[PDB]
Amino acid sequence: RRMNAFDIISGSPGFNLSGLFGDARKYDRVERFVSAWTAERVVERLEEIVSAENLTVAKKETWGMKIEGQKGNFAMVVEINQLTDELVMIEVRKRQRAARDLWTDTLRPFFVELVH
């Protein structure tokens, strides 16, 4: 399977009405990263980061992973789908209770470095 144009459109962070409900949203708006990495390699590297940075794997499934840290302060759901023969779409939904930090300095830069 390869995702189609309407997966891109319908899942875009601004193409829904969730903003109407403000703080009721559990996760921040989805952050998407398009990469030529394989899903298996993305998961492998995430597991290395989990081991190095004192995180927890809440879920590891065919669709991706849920990673937690900091005694309930941080969580992210990472979904990986094939976009083209060459590229995956990585969708990251995260929440952070507290206002450098894990997400800014380590996790988000990892996703950015995947991009290609």
Partner: protein
Amino acid sequence: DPELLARDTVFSVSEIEALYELFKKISSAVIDDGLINKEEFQLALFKTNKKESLFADRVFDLFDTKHNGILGFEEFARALSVFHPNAPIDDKIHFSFQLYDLKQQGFIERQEVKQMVVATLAESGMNLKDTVIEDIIDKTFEEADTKHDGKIDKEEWRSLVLRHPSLLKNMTLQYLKDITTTF
């Protein structure tokens, strides 16, 4: 009287009353006229009037069934009913078809799909090359265009979203299930 709107939508009377609280907040945000204008709708969706979006443009148009460019509570409630988890799927398929028919002259056409792919990739800062976008759109039409005319008609749209239900995820707001506690 909330009983009329409750009868006509999949909301209960209590849910209509909760929805009215949300409506009052949105409608008073820029001009205090008891109505939701486009700017107020953008503020509700995005928390800023600086995000100009074809999704906002299309959805506001489809909410504004009495097409005076401003929303009353009946328009707001009937439109949001479409997004309730228990709304008829046929309503979600119809609304989304009309949404994605950007030029409002029938069909979801290749140019409309491409405009939306380019815009949505830009929301994520993932501005893929034209050859990649064309490949993705090719594959989309390969699957969807069973009545082979190079355009997606309402029956073809129905088939695609029945086949891949996640394509309708933006046509449901799970938050509407808990509206009475939030509001």
